[PDB]
């Protein structure tokens, strides 16, 4: 279903609150994003890890140069956090992603996996900043 | 205050660049 | 769902400070910050 | 700190004359001539342009942001 898959969709507004929070390669790795390719067609890709690009770009108020190593079945390349769209996974895009996953051979994540992963972002959002992370963030 | 999108703020594409 | 937003001292940049947290700005890092104007019906009489 | 809106004694509007007064004083005119050039007959309204101190500038020097 597309509705259950949009629960872990990391929109463009949520990523602005974890630009310098540690454990970025643990809570983010697992969710899906609607990266814009470009005309209005979109392709859902899996978050394999985290990379850092040499180009610095501004995204509204803040500004980040980090990348996002994505993959859609087999075709993989470097992307940016500015091309991500806030739209939800449509039926056509959902079917396209399902077909790509079936063709690539990657087993579809189980429903319980998404159910237990969606809570990660929720528990990270309300995380108290009591440790020594503000110093690294400001640096 | 999770995501006040209200659509969005004109999202750029990859191939457009 | 009000996280008690604040305004930094010199940066004048909004910050979300909750209870049991240090009083510092999201960037640079200072120790001074003020509050924002209330949302009440501030009505005066031009007398 | 800022030019009042009306003269305390008389009541005539004087707020809309500070900029004109500064301009006339800058061009060539003096104070004794500028005051009656603006239209201030009574001596009670003439203090607003002579006694007033413009402290709003120093306040504006402490810009909050940028
Ligand atoms: Zn600070
Ligand atoms: Zn007068």
XYZ file of N, CA and C and ligand atoms in Angstrom:
809
model
N 0.826 -1.195 0.000
C 0.000 0.000 0.000
C 0.868 1.256 0.000
N 0.410 2.333 -0.635
C 1.201 3.571 -0.636
C 1.044 4.358 0.656
N -0.146 4.289 1.259
C -0.407 5.051 2.477
C 0.506 4.605 3.614
N 0.704 3.294 3.764
C 1.583 2.796 4.818
C 3.046 3.104 4.524
N 3.403 3.263 3.249
C 4.785 3.546 2.883
C 5.164 5.005 3.097
N 4.185 5.912 3.133
C 4.462 7.329 3.325
C 4.738 7.693 4.778
N 4.566 6.753 5.712
C 4.798 7.056 7.121
C 6.258 7.410 7.379
N 7.187 6.698 6.731
C 8.611 6.944 6.932
C 9.191 7.901 5.901
N 8.363 8.466 5.025
C 8.850 9.398 4.015
C 9.427 10.644 4.675
N 10.729 10.854 4.502
C 11.414 12.005 5.085
C 11.211 13.208 4.172
N 10.292 14.091 4.553
C 10.007 15.280 3.766
C 11.182 16.256 3.833
N 11.068 17.348 3.075
C 12.122 18.354 3.041
C 12.127 19.242 4.277
N 11.020 19.292 5.021
C 10.958 20.139 6.204
C 11.541 19.453 7.432
N 11.467 18.122 7.495
C 12.000 17.401 8.644
C 13.520 17.310 8.611
N 14.115 17.214 7.420
C 15.563 17.093 7.303
C 16.301 18.354 7.733
N 15.598 19.473 7.909
C 16.228 20.717 8.331
C 16.522 20.755 9.825
N 16.053 19.768 10.587
C 16.259 19.724 12.028
C 17.280 18.677 12.449
N 17.926 18.006 11.495
C 18.969 17.029 11.789
C 20.170 17.231 10.876
N 20.461 18.487 10.526
C 21.591 18.781 9.654
C 22.927 18.535 10.338
N 22.965 18.559 11.675
C 24.215 18.349 12.396
C 24.029 17.460 13.622
N 22.945 16.699 13.684
C 22.704 15.817 14.820
C 23.455 14.505 14.623
N 24.183 14.023 15.629
C 24.869 12.730 15.495
C 23.893 11.598 15.205
N 24.458 10.416 14.949
C 23.678 9.219 14.624
C 22.843 9.424 13.362
N 23.359 10.225 12.426
C 22.631 10.492 11.190
C 22.617 9.283 10.265
N 23.603 8.396 10.385
C 23.694 7.218 9.537
C 22.941 6.023 10.109
N 22.226 6.206 11.217
C 21.476 5.132 11.858
C 19.970 5.326 11.760
N 19.468 6.513 12.107
C 18.033 6.763 12.025
C 17.577 7.043 10.599
N 18.433 7.654 9.780
C 18.043 7.987 8.413
C 18.155 6.769 7.506
N 19.161 5.926 7.734
C 19.369 4.736 6.915
C 18.228 3.752 7.149
N 17.346 3.624 6.162
C 16.201 2.744 6.267
C 14.941 3.362 5.698
N 14.841 4.685 5.777
C 13.684 5.394 5.261
C 13.832 5.645 3.762
N 12.731 6.063 3.142
C 12.687 6.348 1.718
C 12.339 7.814 1.499
N 12.768 8.349 0.356
C 12.526 9.742 0.005
C 12.090 9.819 -1.451
N 11.326 10.861 -1.768
C 10.859 11.093 -3.134
C 11.775 12.102 -3.826
N 12.973 11.624 -4.165
C 13.959 12.467 -4.829
C 13.457 12.854 -6.213
N 13.607 14.132 -6.557
C 13.167 14.628 -7.848
C 14.265 14.503 -8.885
N 13.940 13.854 -9.996
C 14.891 13.627 -11.082
C 14.734 14.664 -12.185
N 13.512 14.856 -12.673
C 13.259 15.807 -13.738
C 13.492 15.228 -15.120
N 8.758 15.130 -17.017
C 9.348 16.185 -16.203
C 8.928 16.051 -14.742
N 7.624 15.908 -14.502
C 7.131 15.706 -13.135
C 7.259 14.281 -12.619
N 7.985 13.409 -13.319
C 8.129 12.027 -12.880
C 9.080 11.963 -11.694
N 8.769 11.091 -10.740
C 9.599 10.896 -9.562
C 9.953 9.422 -9.428
N 11.051 9.161 -8.720
C 11.547 7.805 -8.522
C 11.959 7.644 -7.069
N 11.336 6.696 -6.377
C 11.679 6.411 -4.989
C 12.964 5.598 -4.951
N 13.853 5.947 -4.025
C 15.144 5.290 -3.903
C 15.412 4.946 -2.444
N 16.250 3.933 -2.244
C 16.605 3.473 -0.910
C 17.824 4.226 -0.395
N 17.824 4.513 0.904
C 18.922 5.224 1.549
C 19.952 4.179 1.968
N 21.046 4.092 1.208
C 22.097 3.131 1.524
C 23.029 3.654 2.611
N 23.320 4.952 2.597
C 24.198 5.540 3.588
C 24.209 7.054 3.546
N 25.353 7.654 3.863
C 25.504 9.105 3.870
C 26.855 9.458 3.269
N 26.870 10.488 2.423
C 28.083 10.964 1.775
C 28.183 12.471 1.978
N 29.316 13.029 1.555
C 29.581 14.458 1.678
C 30.089 14.979 0.343
N 29.366 15.931 -0.235
C 29.742 16.529 -1.507
C 30.620 17.757 -1.284
N 31.413 18.083 -2.302
C 32.327 19.215 -2.238
C 31.667 20.534 -2.613
N 30.387 20.521 -2.971
C 29.659 21.726 -3.345
C 28.780 22.167 -2.182
N 28.857 23.449 -1.835
C 28.091 24.016 -0.731
C 26.921 24.796 -1.312
N 25.708 24.441 -0.896
C 24.494 25.074 -1.386
C 23.600 25.448 -0.214
N 22.808 26.499 -0.407
C 21.891 26.989 0.610
C 20.487 26.461 0.346
N 19.828 26.003 1.406
C 18.470 25.465 1.339
C 17.584 26.327 2.234
N 17.030 27.392 1.664
C 16.195 28.303 2.422
C 16.985 29.108 3.432
N 16.777 28.830 4.716
C 17.489 29.533 5.763
C 18.852 28.935 6.047
N 18.886 27.637 6.334
C 20.130 26.947 6.639
C 20.875 26.627 5.343
N 21.987 25.902 5.459
C 22.790 25.535 4.299
C 23.628 24.317 4.650
N 23.573 23.294 3.799
C 24.320 22.064 4.011
C 24.923 21.601 2.694
N 26.090 20.968 2.785
C 26.781 20.424 1.624
C 26.797 18.902 1.602
N 26.220 18.250 2.608
C 26.219 16.796 2.668
C 25.379 16.197 1.545
N 25.776 15.002 1.105
C 25.071 14.285 0.067
C 24.197 13.177 0.628
N 23.703 12.334 -0.279
C 22.842 11.218 0.112
C 22.958 10.131 -0.953
N 23.720 9.084 -0.649
C 23.938 7.986 -1.589
C 22.657 7.167 -1.680
N 21.891 7.383 -2.742
C 20.639 6.678 -2.966
C 20.806 5.633 -4.061
N 19.792 4.779 -4.185
C 19.787 3.717 -5.183
C 18.344 3.334 -5.467
N 18.007 3.187 -6.748
C 16.675 2.764 -7.174
C 16.834 1.444 -7.920
N 16.931 0.360 -7.155
C 17.063 -0.972 -7.708
C 18.494 -1.313 -8.063
N 18.999 -0.707 -9.120
C 20.371 -0.901 -9.573
C 21.062 0.411 -9.899
N 20.345 1.365 -10.488
C 20.934 2.643 -10.863
C 21.195 3.469 -9.611
N 22.467 3.746 -9.336
C 22.855 4.503 -8.157
C 23.802 5.625 -8.554
N 23.691 6.740 -7.841
C 24.522 7.914 -8.072
C 24.331 8.861 -6.895
N 25.148 9.908 -6.865
C 25.104 10.883 -5.783
C 23.942 11.838 -6.011
N 23.308 12.261 -4.921
C 22.181 13.182 -4.962
C 22.398 14.278 -3.925
N 21.399 15.146 -3.782
C 21.462 16.248 -2.835
C 20.143 16.340 -2.082
N 20.196 16.977 -0.914
C 19.018 17.142 -0.072
C 18.100 18.261 -0.546
N 18.483 18.993 -1.591
C 17.669 20.089 -2.099
C 16.682 19.649 -3.171
N 16.951 18.537 -3.856
C 16.055 18.038 -4.890
C 14.894 17.228 -4.332
N 14.936 16.862 -3.048
C 13.864 16.066 -2.463
C 12.569 16.866 -2.461
N 11.471 16.198 -2.796
C 10.158 16.820 -2.839
C 9.350 16.448 -1.600
N 8.349 17.273 -1.305
C 7.473 17.055 -0.162
C 6.223 16.261 -0.514
N 6.041 15.898 -1.781
C 4.870 15.136 -2.180
C 4.973 13.692 -1.695
N 3.814 13.063 -1.535
C 3.744 11.685 -1.077
C 3.828 10.725 -2.259
N 4.160 9.471 -1.952
C 4.298 8.445 -2.978
C 2.963 8.179 -3.662
N 2.870 8.510 -4.946
C 1.642 8.301 -5.694
C 1.509 6.833 -6.096
N 0.313 6.474 -6.569
C 0.063 5.098 -6.989
C 0.974 4.702 -8.144
N 1.117 5.582 -9.136
C 1.981 5.289 -10.275
C 3.431 5.134 -9.832
N 3.918 6.068 -9.011
C 5.286 5.968 -8.514
C 5.455 4.758 -7.604
N 4.425 4.426 -6.821
C 4.487 3.237 -5.976
C 4.651 1.978 -6.820
N 3.856 1.858 -7.886
C 3.965 0.698 -8.764
C 5.309 0.673 -9.480
N 5.811 1.842 -9.889
C 7.123 1.898 -10.528
C 8.219 1.428 -9.579
N 8.170 1.875 -8.322
C 9.160 1.445 -7.340
C 9.054 -0.049 -7.069
N 7.827 -0.568 -6.972
C 7.649 -2.003 -6.769
C 8.229 -2.799 -7.931
N 7.966 -2.358 -9.164
C 8.506 -3.047 -10.332
C 10.028 -2.988 -10.354
N 10.603 -1.830 -10.013
C 12.058 -1.707 -9.976
C 12.663 -2.635 -8.930
N 12.042 -2.709 -7.749
C 12.528 -3.608 -6.707
C 12.435 -5.064 -7.147
N 11.321 -5.442 -7.781
C 11.162 -6.815 -8.249
C 12.177 -7.157 -9.334
N 12.481 -6.200 -10.212
C 13.445 -6.453 -11.279
C 14.869 -6.531 -10.741
N 15.199 -5.702 -9.750
C 16.550 -5.693 -9.206
C 16.841 -6.888 -8.309
N 15.810 -7.577 -7.823
C 15.990 -8.720 -6.958
C 16.053 -8.402 -5.481
N 16.077 -7.124 -5.107
C 16.099 -6.750 -3.700
C 14.751 -7.064 -3.065
N 14.769 -7.867 -2.004
C 13.533 -8.234 -1.326
C 12.875 -7.012 -0.698
N 11.564 -6.908 -0.875
C 10.817 -5.788 -0.322
C 10.878 -5.829 1.202
N 11.152 -4.705 1.867
C 11.165 -4.707 3.335
C 9.822 -5.142 3.904
N 9.881 -5.929 4.975
C 8.671 -6.417 5.620
C 7.938 -5.279 6.321
N 6.621 -5.446 6.470
C 5.803 -4.392 7.061
C 6.244 -4.083 8.487
N 6.582 -5.120 9.262
C 7.049 -4.901 10.626
C 8.325 -4.072 10.654
N 9.169 -4.197 9.626
C 10.385 -3.391 9.560
C 10.050 -1.905 9.511
N 9.125 -1.519 8.630
C 8.720 -0.119 8.544
C 8.000 0.304 9.817
N 7.198 -0.597 10.392
C 6.466 -0.272 11.613
C 7.419 0.051 12.757
N 8.504 -0.714 12.882
C 9.468 -0.485 13.950
C 10.491 0.587 13.597
N 10.622 0.939 12.318
C 11.547 1.992 11.918
C 10.924 3.378 11.982
N 9.612 3.489 11.749
C 8.965 4.795 11.791
C 9.040 5.419 13.179
N 9.121 4.594 14.226
C 9.248 5.118 15.581
C 10.615 5.738 15.840
N 11.622 5.401 15.030
C 12.961 5.943 15.244
C 12.969 7.459 15.093
N 12.342 7.966 14.029
C 12.287 9.409 13.816
C 11.483 10.081 14.920
N 10.378 9.456 15.333
C 9.543 10.030 16.384
C 10.319 10.158 17.689
N 11.061 9.111 18.059
C 11.819 9.149 19.305
C 13.046 10.047 19.195
N 13.586 10.226 17.987
C 14.704 11.144 17.812
C 14.261 12.599 17.852
N 13.038 12.889 17.399
C 12.556 14.267 17.391
C 12.460 14.827 18.804
N 11.936 14.034 19.742
C 11.788 14.448 21.132
C 13.006 14.100 21.981
N 14.180 13.973 21.368
C 15.386 13.625 22.107
C 15.927 14.852 22.828
N 16.139 14.717 24.135
C 16.660 15.818 24.931
C 18.145 16.011 24.652
N 18.545 17.258 24.412
C 19.939 17.574 24.102
C 20.738 17.821 25.384
N 20.844 16.767 26.196
C 21.570 16.852 27.455
C 23.049 16.523 27.314
N 23.438 15.786 26.278
C 24.835 15.419 26.094
C 25.594 16.585 25.459
N 26.835 16.338 25.052
C 27.693 17.377 24.484
C 27.639 17.364 22.956
N 26.437 17.586 22.427
C 26.242 17.640 20.984
C 26.059 19.055 20.455
N 25.690 20.011 21.313
C 25.493 21.383 20.851
C 26.810 21.975 20.366
N 27.917 21.618 21.022
C 29.221 22.134 20.614
C 29.556 21.710 19.189
N 29.371 20.426 18.878
C 29.636 19.958 17.522
C 28.693 20.611 16.521
N 27.429 20.803 16.908
C 26.458 21.427 16.013
C 26.884 22.850 15.669
N 27.268 23.632 16.683
C 27.673 25.010 16.424
C 28.971 25.046 15.625
N 29.895 24.119 15.898
C 31.140 24.074 15.134
C 30.872 23.785 13.661
N 4.138 21.794 14.427
C 5.359 22.340 13.847
C 6.232 21.258 13.224
N 5.627 20.146 12.803
C 6.394 19.063 12.195
C 6.816 19.426 10.775
N 5.845 19.722 9.911
C 6.131 20.048 8.514
C 5.055 21.020 8.039
N 5.362 22.317 8.103
C 4.426 23.361 7.685
C 4.625 23.664 6.199
N 4.277 22.675 5.381
C 4.412 22.798 3.944
C 3.388 23.725 3.324
N 2.113 23.353 3.427
C 1.003 24.142 2.888
C 1.119 24.318 1.374
N 2.565 21.350 -3.909
C 2.683 22.336 -2.843
C 4.076 22.316 -2.222
N 4.472 23.443 -1.638
C 5.784 23.569 -1.033
C 6.463 24.887 -1.340
N 7.714 24.831 -1.798
C 8.484 26.034 -2.102
C 9.279 25.850 -3.387
N 8.641 25.282 -4.408
C 9.262 25.031 -5.711
C 10.511 24.162 -5.572
N 10.317 22.847 -5.617
C 11.419 21.906 -5.464
C 12.182 21.756 -6.776
N 13.506 21.979 -6.739
C 14.336 21.839 -7.941
C 14.536 20.380 -8.347
N 14.891 20.159 -9.607
C 15.126 18.823 -10.132
C 16.621 18.560 -10.287
N 16.947 17.305 -10.604
C 18.343 16.919 -10.781
C 18.824 17.270 -12.185
N 18.099 16.814 -13.209
C 18.485 17.090 -14.580
C 18.355 18.543 -14.981
N 17.564 19.326 -14.241
C 17.416 20.743 -14.558
C 18.743 21.481 -14.437
N 19.570 21.091 -13.470
C 20.862 21.717 -13.269
C 21.832 21.482 -14.411
N 1.495 22.120 21.537
C 2.825 21.747 21.073
C 3.715 22.979 20.926
N 3.995 23.632 22.052
C 4.812 24.839 22.080
C 6.159 24.524 22.709
N 7.249 24.502 21.943
C 8.556 24.157 22.511
C 9.284 25.321 23.165
N 8.597 26.436 23.422
C 9.177 27.624 24.050
C 10.345 28.165 23.216
N 9.976 28.703 22.052
C 10.957 29.318 21.172
C 11.591 30.527 21.862
N 12.877 30.752 21.581
C 13.611 31.910 22.072
C 14.297 32.628 20.916
N 14.845 33.803 21.222
C 15.628 34.600 20.284
C 17.028 34.740 20.858
N 18.038 34.470 20.035
C 19.419 34.547 20.483
C 19.800 35.982 20.833
N 20.922 36.114 21.536
C 21.405 37.412 21.958
C 21.914 38.260 20.813
N 23.037 37.867 20.215
C 23.632 38.653 19.140
C 23.200 38.186 17.758
N 22.970 36.884 17.579
C 22.546 36.385 16.276
C 21.112 36.780 15.951
N 20.273 36.968 16.970
C 18.848 37.245 16.783
C 18.193 36.172 15.918
N 18.640 34.935 16.097
C 18.120 33.788 15.369
C 17.250 32.958 16.301
N 16.085 32.546 15.809
C 15.153 31.779 16.624
C 15.783 30.465 17.067
N 15.454 30.040 18.286
C 15.943 28.780 18.821
C 14.830 28.113 19.614
N 14.818 26.783 19.584
C 13.841 25.987 20.325
C 14.530 25.415 21.558
N 14.244 25.999 22.717
C 14.830 25.573 23.982
C 13.723 24.972 24.834
N 13.916 23.729 25.257
C 12.981 23.028 26.123
C 13.566 22.915 27.524
N 12.745 22.422 28.446
C 13.173 22.296 29.832
C 14.324 21.304 29.948
N 15.131 21.484 30.996
C 16.273 20.617 31.283
C 17.269 20.601 30.126
N 17.507 21.768 29.537
C 18.438 21.922 28.432
C 19.318 23.137 28.677
N 20.534 23.147 28.135
C 21.387 24.329 28.287
C 20.856 25.508 27.490
N 21.209 26.702 27.949
C 20.766 27.948 27.329
C 21.897 28.400 26.409
N 21.816 27.992 25.143
C 22.806 28.352 24.137
C 22.125 28.399 22.778
N 22.767 29.096 21.845
C 22.237 29.251 20.501
C 22.565 28.032 19.644
N 21.744 27.824 18.608
C 21.952 26.684 17.718
C 23.264 26.792 16.955
N 23.726 28.007 16.684
C 24.982 28.240 15.985
C 25.919 29.001 16.915
N 27.122 29.293 16.409
C 28.176 29.996 17.141
C 28.273 29.506 18.580
N 27.326 29.930 19.412
C 27.257 29.500 20.792
C 27.517 30.627 21.766
N 26.443 31.241 22.244
C 26.483 32.302 23.236
C 25.661 31.874 24.445
N 25.576 32.765 25.430
C 24.873 32.473 26.670
C 23.739 33.449 26.945
N 23.435 34.346 26.014
C 22.397 35.353 26.187
C 21.313 35.115 25.149
N 20.055 35.175 25.583
C 18.932 35.035 24.668
C 17.674 35.552 25.347
N 16.810 36.183 24.561
C 15.579 36.786 25.045
C 14.376 36.009 24.528
N 13.201 36.386 25.014
C 11.958 35.741 24.622
C 11.261 36.536 23.523
N 10.199 35.946 22.989
C 9.397 36.551 21.938
C 8.153 37.196 22.538
N 7.592 38.155 21.803
C 6.392 38.841 22.261
C 5.261 37.844 22.465
N 4.469 38.070 23.509
C 3.322 37.220 23.778
C 2.345 37.241 22.603
N 1.419 36.288 22.621
C 0.396 36.178 21.594
C -0.955 36.692 22.066
N -0.990 37.406 23.187
C -2.238 37.885 23.752
C -2.716 39.127 23.005
N -3.915 39.585 23.362
C -4.510 40.761 22.732
C -3.931 42.003 23.403
N -2.763 42.419 22.919
C -2.113 43.627 23.421
C -2.849 44.808 22.797
N -3.747 45.419 23.563
C -4.567 46.532 23.098
C -4.346 47.713 24.026
N -3.933 48.838 23.459
C -3.728 50.059 24.216
C -4.754 51.109 23.819
N -4.894 52.100 24.688
C -5.743 53.256 24.453
C -4.828 54.448 24.225
N -4.903 55.026 23.030
C -4.057 56.159 22.689
C -4.481 57.383 23.485
N -4.241 57.364 24.791
C -4.641 58.468 25.650
C -3.427 59.236 26.163
N 13.379 62.417 22.473
C 14.038 61.421 21.642
C 13.619 61.580 20.184
N 12.328 61.810 19.974
C 11.769 62.022 18.647
C 10.939 63.298 18.691
N 10.829 63.962 17.545
C 10.079 65.222 17.485
C 8.624 64.962 17.869
N 8.037 65.745 18.774
C 6.631 65.538 19.139
C 5.709 65.738 17.948
N 4.442 65.391 18.149
C 3.443 65.573 17.102
C 2.825 66.963 17.156
N 2.601 67.497 18.354
C 1.991 68.809 18.507
C 2.723 69.587 19.590
N 2.607 70.910 19.512
C 3.220 71.780 20.505
C 2.475 71.672 21.828
N 3.228 71.508 22.918
C 2.606 71.304 24.223
C 1.709 72.476 24.590
N 2.192 73.699 24.379
C 1.429 74.868 24.797
C 0.294 75.158 23.825
N 0.633 75.461 22.574
C -0.367 75.819 21.579
C -1.206 74.624 21.146
N -0.572 73.657 20.491
C -1.256 72.496 19.951
C -1.045 72.290 18.466
N -0.436 73.250 17.774
C -0.192 73.137 16.343
C 0.699 71.939 16.035
N 0.436 71.291 14.900
C 1.230 70.137 14.493
C 2.629 70.608 14.126
N 3.639 69.978 14.722
C 5.028 70.352 14.488
C 5.812 69.106 14.096
N 5.181 67.940 14.231
C 5.850 66.704 13.857
C 6.218 66.652 12.388
N 5.370 67.210 11.528
C 5.588 67.167 10.091
C 6.473 68.305 9.596
N 7.310 68.871 10.465
C 8.174 69.973 10.076
C 9.643 69.777 10.416
N 10.006 68.730 11.161
C 11.404 68.543 11.539
C 12.289 68.343 10.312
N 11.858 67.487 9.383
C 12.651 67.246 8.182
C 12.768 68.509 7.341
N 11.661 69.237 7.179
C 11.701 70.490 6.437
C 12.623 71.492 7.117
N 12.590 71.538 8.451
C 13.454 72.455 9.187
C 14.920 72.123 8.951
N 15.268 70.837 9.017
C 16.648 70.440 8.765
C 17.063 70.780 7.340
N 16.181 70.533 6.370
C 16.511 70.852 4.989
C 16.737 72.335 4.772
N 15.857 73.170 5.330
C 16.016 74.613 5.186
C 17.291 75.094 5.862
N 17.600 74.560 7.048
C 18.844 74.941 7.708
C 20.057 74.492 6.910
N 19.954 73.357 6.222
C 21.084 72.866 5.446
C 21.307 73.695 4.189
N 20.233 74.093 3.504
C 20.411 74.733 2.206
C 21.179 76.047 2.311
N 20.544 77.100 2.830
C 21.273 78.317 3.168
C 20.696 78.988 4.410
N 19.418 78.735 4.684
C 18.680 79.517 5.666
C 19.220 79.304 7.075
N 19.013 80.308 7.920
C 19.377 80.245 9.324
C 18.147 79.849 10.138
N 18.312 79.785 11.459
C 17.217 79.342 12.314
C 16.143 80.416 12.427
N 16.558 81.647 12.736
C 15.613 82.738 12.892
C 14.776 82.995 11.657
N 15.300 82.653 10.482
C 14.560 82.809 9.237
C 13.768 81.555 8.888
N 14.349 80.378 9.123
C 13.647 79.136 8.816
C 12.378 78.991 9.644
N 12.418 79.397 10.916
C 11.248 79.220 11.772
C 10.031 79.950 11.216
N 10.198 81.208 10.805
C 9.067 81.918 10.219
C 8.850 81.553 8.757
N 9.822 80.901 8.113
C 9.574 80.402 6.767
C 8.679 79.173 6.796
N 8.766 78.372 7.858
C 7.917 77.194 7.972
C 6.491 77.564 8.354
N 6.315 78.668 9.077
C 4.995 79.140 9.442
C 4.742 79.141 10.935
N 5.797 79.352 11.717
C 5.716 79.354 13.177
C 5.774 80.797 13.665
N 4.607 81.358 13.978
C 4.541 82.730 14.467
C 4.793 82.788 15.968
N 3.982 82.072 16.743
C 4.082 82.122 18.196
C 5.416 81.560 18.670
N 5.963 82.171 19.723
C 7.246 81.734 20.260
C 7.143 80.418 21.019
N 5.933 79.988 21.380
C 5.796 78.740 22.124
C 6.033 77.532 21.231
N 5.662 77.621 19.956
C 5.890 76.528 19.024
C 7.308 76.509 18.472
N 8.085 77.575 18.675
C 9.436 77.615 18.130
C 10.427 76.824 18.965
N 10.085 76.490 20.209
C 11.011 75.708 21.017
C 11.090 74.271 20.522
N 10.001 73.760 19.937
C 9.985 72.380 19.462
C 11.052 72.112 18.410
N 11.430 73.118 17.626
C 12.471 72.925 16.627
C 13.847 73.356 17.110
N 13.917 74.148 18.176
C 15.182 74.606 18.733
C 15.614 73.808 19.950
N 14.686 73.503 20.853
C 15.029 72.748 22.047
C 15.072 71.246 21.814
N 14.360 70.738 20.813
C 14.274 69.296 20.628
C 15.644 68.684 20.376
N 15.897 67.556 21.027
C 17.118 66.787 20.838
C 16.736 65.534 20.063
N 17.542 65.197 19.059
C 17.247 64.069 18.181
C 18.095 62.885 18.634
N 17.578 62.161 19.622
C 18.270 61.006 20.172
C 17.868 59.698 19.510
N 16.858 59.711 18.639
C 16.439 58.475 17.989
C 17.559 57.919 17.120
N 18.460 58.781 16.638
C 19.569 58.312 15.813
C 20.479 57.375 16.598
N 20.884 57.795 17.799
C 21.728 56.946 18.632
C 21.036 55.628 18.945
N 19.722 55.667 19.174
C 18.979 54.434 19.404
C 19.024 53.534 18.177
N 18.852 54.114 16.988
C 18.904 53.328 15.762
C 20.292 52.765 15.504
N 21.335 53.367 16.084
C 22.678 52.825 15.902
C 22.791 51.404 16.441
N 21.993 51.056 17.450
C 21.999 49.702 18.007
C 21.011 48.808 17.257
N 21.291 48.606 15.975
C 20.413 47.797 15.145
C 20.333 46.377 15.699
N 19.139 45.795 15.813
C 19.039 44.429 16.342
C 19.777 43.416 15.479
N 19.380 43.293 14.215
C 19.942 42.307 13.303
C 20.537 43.008 12.088
N 21.672 42.494 11.620
C 22.408 43.072 10.497
C 22.720 44.547 10.733
Zn 24.748 29.327 20.889
Zn 3.879 76.618 20.538
